Design a binder for this molecule. Sequence first.
Ligand SMILES: CCCCCCCCCCCCCCCC(=O)SCCNC(=O)CCNC(=O)[C@H](O)C(C)(C)COP(=O)(O)OP(=O)(O)OC[C@H]1O[C@@H](n2cnc3c(N)ncnc32)[C@H](O)[C@@H]1OP(=O)(O)O
Ligand SMILES: CCCCCCCCCCCCCCCC(=O)SCCNC(=O)CCNC(=O)[C@H](O)C(C)(C)COP(=O)(O)OP(=O)(O)OC[C@H]1O[C@@H](n2cnc3c(N)ncnc32)[C@H](O)[C@@H]1OP(=O)(O)O
Ligand SMILES: CCCCCCCCCCCCCCCC(=O)SCCNC(=O)CCNC(=O)[C@H](O)C(C)(C)COP(=O)(O)OP(=O)(O)OC[C@H]1O[C@@H](n2cnc3c(N)ncnc32)[C@H](O)[C@@H]1OP(=O)(O)O
Ligand SMILES: CCCCCCCCCCCCCCCC(=O)SCCNC(=O)CCNC(=O)[C@H](O)C(C)(C)COP(=O)(O)OP(=O)(O)OC[C@H]1O[C@@H](n2cnc3c(N)ncnc32)[C@H](O)[C@@H]1OP(=O)(O)O
Lengths: 267, 267
Amino acid sequence: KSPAGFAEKYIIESIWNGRFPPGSILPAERELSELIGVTRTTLREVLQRLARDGWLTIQHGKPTKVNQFMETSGLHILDTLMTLDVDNATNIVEDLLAARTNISPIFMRYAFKANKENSERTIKNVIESCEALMNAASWDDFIASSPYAEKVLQNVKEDNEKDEAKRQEILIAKTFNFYDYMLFQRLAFHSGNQIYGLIFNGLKKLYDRVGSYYFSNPASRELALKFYHQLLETCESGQREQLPVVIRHYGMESALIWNEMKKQLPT
Amino acid sequence: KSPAGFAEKYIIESIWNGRFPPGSILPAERELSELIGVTRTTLREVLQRLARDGWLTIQHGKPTKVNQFMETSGLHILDTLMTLDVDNATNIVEDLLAARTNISPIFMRYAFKANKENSERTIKNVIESCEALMNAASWDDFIASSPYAEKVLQNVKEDNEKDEAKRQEILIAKTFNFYDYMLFQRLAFHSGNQIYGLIFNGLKKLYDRVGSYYFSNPASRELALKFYHQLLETCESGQREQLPVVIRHYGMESALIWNEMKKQLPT
Ligand SMILES: CCCCCCCCCCCCCCCC(=O)SCCNC(=O)CCNC(=O)[C@H](O)C(C)(C)COP(=O)(O)OP(=O)(O)OC[C@H]1O[C@@H](n2cnc3c(N)ncnc32)[C@H](O)[C@@H]1OP(=O)(O)O
Ligand SMILES: CCCCCCCCCCCCCCCC(=O)SCCNC(=O)CCNC(=O)[C@H](O)C(C)(C)COP(=O)(O)OP(=O)(O)OC[C@H]1O[C@@H](n2cnc3c(N)ncnc32)[C@H](O)[C@@H]1OP(=O)(O)O
Ligand SMILES: CCCCCCCCCCCCCCCC(=O)SCCNC(=O)CCNC(=O)[C@H](O)C(C)(C)COP(=O)(O)OP(=O)(O)OC[C@H]1O[C@@H](n2cnc3c(N)ncnc32)[C@H](O)[C@@H]1OP(=O)(O)O
Ligand SMILES: CCCCCCCCCCCCCCCC(=O)SCCNC(=O)CCNC(=O)[C@H](O)C(C)(C)COP(=O)(O)OP(=O)(O)OC[C@H]1O[C@@H](n2cnc3c(N)ncnc32)[C@H](O)[C@@H]1OP(=O)(O)O
């Protein structure tokens, strides 16, 4: 769908996986254009957006280079993080998603063990809210109920989509993501190790973008809700050993939904 | 024994664990002083150093406040991160160390299964250098040998300690840390998931501060080297499942060395 979007995605992912290492000089524009298979004019502007997003270093009368990162530019991994999306950084997102599956069994294990009460409260609260989000006649109906109408309206907004039916779906997606984030992030802080909770805080904007996209699929919400229940039942039963299975199982099943939805992406 | 260092440590860790949330108002200087148990004039200069380091917001005739950090200031987790050391953020560092123990079995497992050869090569490369660092007559002797004399001189420097005997010891500690970092960071990138490798990159400065301190103890170096060997044997034997045991064991033994060394910290 988008040749410009594809070129941006390729370069970014090439930098990410080390083909275009953070210090290196980018392949010549001619060779780079031939490589990715896009028009030379398209590539030349993609490089400029990519240098504004903080991936590249463009300079008059000099070879284009990949940026050094690691506080070299100062807040150089984060100014780029603001530009990350599902379209242009699919592999970066999937790595984060994989890591989320890998590490969740760790901090949720700590949380169910030292904060058995708090964990159950969190998961129950997410389940009730999500289940009230679904089942509702409309998004407004959900907001009209719910003890946290204020908190949700603060964090969930479209204000751009004007088609009533479409804005409704977007709001449902963002609201469900809102509670998915809450479940993982809050259980992360209940681990006793602030670093797990802090990671989610740092990545909330990207989290919101991918989540609002992922949970626009009804199956995504059904699967997650069912997964939340498994978490609750696993916690109250004190069955630790099942945690890595439940989470990895959900990671697998959510993976196949993700891959079906990965099709139809314009890049 | 440093009361000023303690006050700073208390405040920093209190922000970390949520007692003083990123938005909150700090307790008034007198009460905060009674609270931490340090003289208010000492606390008054500690607050000023803390506001220069980017933790607090002080204003004449107004309540001192904690800073927002998360994206509020935008990319603010780095302005504070550069000031952290073993003295003023002991608990923050211990959280990072625990997380390192928790997650290492994850990305090292991926690396041993998908990169068995490169993993063994990496571990062999680290073991040989460390064993050459030890056994060597001095740091200069290690540098005079070693195929990577240039690379190490680029990354390992004192340039401050004037006692030749003391500077020599510092260089040995920094050099061992150099290879400890290499083992974890490179196996993390060999996991296939760039995010694990990137975590170490982002925390390298703190890693170096803590490591040069930790590996200034000969037993720490002795212990780590033994651990590296076990990693090699775990990889070559293909016994992945043993990985979390080997790593948690080392986490245990390095912990008690850490705890013994925690005595004599001025804070
Ligand atoms: C706040 C905290 C979290 C922050 C985190 C947040 C993340 C928020 C997400 C946002 C996401 C957007 C921001 C992404 C921005 C990117 O950074 S993109 C991601 C890609 N980043 C990368 O660094 C690429 C990964 N790959 C690499 O770094 C390199 O390939 C490696 C792993 C360092 C090298 O791999 P290798 O094959 O094993 O090479 P190796 O044999 O080890 O030799 C390398 C060097 O070590 C030297 N060396 C080798 N052996 C020895 C020895 N025994 N002694 C001394 N030197 C030696 C070699 O001489 C060589 O020297 P150089 O010529 O390179 O200078
Ligand atoms: C870029 C890569 C990443 C980098 C990443 C950093 C990397 C790292 C290395 C650096 C190293 C330096 C290190 C620096 C150190 C620091 O500068 S940061 C130190 C700590 N910073 C923090 O932000 C810790 C913050 N902790 C907290 O905010 C809280 O403890 C928690 C855990 C999030 C909340 O606990 P909680 O009891 O479960 O709270 P909860 O029940 O959910 O209620 C809170 C809100 O949720 C709402 N709520 C509750 N139930 C519902 C419901 N059903 N529906 C809707 N709303 C609800 C409530 O209404 C309430 O609303 P608010 O009135 O507060 O606005
Ligand atoms: C933590 C903080 C991050 C959070 C950062 C926040 C930002 C986050 C971005 C967007 C946030 C939106 C979040 C809301 C919207 C959704 O919730 S989107 C949800 C969509 N779901 C996904 O994309 C799936 C994520 N990916 C995954 O969960 C994992 O990659 C999968 C699918 C479970 C695959 O697991 P895998 O270990 O990575 O790969 P795989 O080789 O197939 O599995 C290894 C198996 O072979 C064996 N094996 C182990 N190692 C190896 C090896 N190296 N080679 C071969 N075999 C191996 C193992 O035995 C294992 O089997 P079992 O352990 O079960 O016995
Ligand atoms: C993401 C960042 C990556 C890292 C990026 C590093 C960069 C940041 C700079 C530092 C880099 C310098 C490094 C170079 C210089 C050295 O090499 S310094 C190394 C010195 N060593 C240390 O400081 C010790 C590190 N700490 C550890 O390894 C682990 O905390 C320990 C010592 C193994 C113990 O932690 P633990 O496993 O979580 O707790 P533990 O009770 O002993 O055993 C686990 C049990 O606790 C229970 N538990 C229940 N609730 C909890 C809870 N809330 N918490 C803990 N355990 C719980 C569990 O049920 C669990 O059950 P089981 O395992 O028995 O089945």
